[PDB]
Amino acid sequence: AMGSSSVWGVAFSPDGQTIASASDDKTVKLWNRNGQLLQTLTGHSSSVWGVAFSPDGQTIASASDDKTVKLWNRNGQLLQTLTGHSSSVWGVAFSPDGQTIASASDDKTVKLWNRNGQLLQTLTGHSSSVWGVAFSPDGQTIASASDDKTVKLWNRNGQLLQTLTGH
Template sequence: MIDVRSITISEDGLSLISAGMSGSEPNDQGSYDGEVRVWDLQSGELTSTIPGLFDEMSVVTIGDDRQTLVVSDRHHNIQLWNLETEEPLQALPDIGYFTELLILSQDGQTLITANPDDQTVQVWTVESQQVVQSFNAGHEAIVIEGSDRPVEVPGRRSRIALSNDGKTLATTGLDKIIKLWNLETAELILTFPTDHEYPIHSLTFSPDGETLASGSSDNTVKLWNREGELLHTLTGHESTVFSLQYSPNGKILATSDLDSTVNVWNPTTGELIQTLAEEPVREGETAASLSFSPNGEILAGVNYDGTIKVWQVTR
């Protein structure tokens, strides 16, 4: 089983990039090395491999710019890599904690990290490797995916969401409360309780930043405006909603759950447009990550068993 942790479709729409474990023998330290793989999106053939950028204990995510890999390792270091040149970019050495909560801004200039132990959010300028804002999010323990009901352990990056303009951060925790923050001033803009029955496992802004989507272990997705008003409740999943992804133009929202069901919605009307996957190969084969092509016509999803699936999306 190959552990694929993050995927993206290239800017030209021709390739799919995945970051995960190599599946080879352990290294000299007894851990497994990670690698980045590049696939031809049409044929599904592997075209290139970039080894040695991280190991199995690292958290990796591909930035929204579709070309930067962010690696958080167990020694509290964060390293950025350019996937086109395979060259290291800036590094943040020993930030003081290991984090799975990472967001790189769309322009690649700002990195958001969160300390799972004390809920401190830090805003870094990538070029200078300096903290420019720091504040406590003040939630109960942030939840982690892995079961259909939450447990109080450190969470992953899906519990924080950054608007595309890089100015607003949304945070949530076991308290089922969403907070919106001004990242330029570290000011709390808005706090609003949700009526999710269970904690929120996924969070994302629409491309225009005007709508926030939250997915929960109550099997629903809720859409909110910037005033914290509920716009729609999307029902159609039968297990925890773990992944949310808007198309680049914001006209489509894709959601996936613990049972590997992937639904495609019209976020304006709340209408279910299409169900792409309903039958997992085996129990627990969750669709862990979703990525749209730049034109919004192709959606890729990866299961926790390493299987990558690609669909044509009805528009």
């Protein structure tokens, strides 16, 4: 049971029957495998950059230029808005159980959240915009990638474990 992340540019649902895509109009669209539109997720007030399905398949996360991450159910309903980043959010990922969300922001931080929208941790250390984030299968360990040309590995108590590329 792996995490799910926006970093590969594809967000299949766990059964592969639904696919989520960031649209060019501040929306996320859900499609079936035949290219038919199922849901438009409306609510972001600026560009949507990253999307992920929870491994539960019931929740979708979207990262936006409007500095928020939004959580949606599969039937298109907005569930939560995760606020706290001070700049664009580029990337979003779910832990393998779907109960933790990680967000990667232009504000140089990764933030970790629960599904009720509560901020759990801020990972600070990157000297530049953080564009990518992903969980380990153990669900304890997090990788982030930044324009500072480094990749950092963290615990979910927010301690830096290693800088894997770069310095």
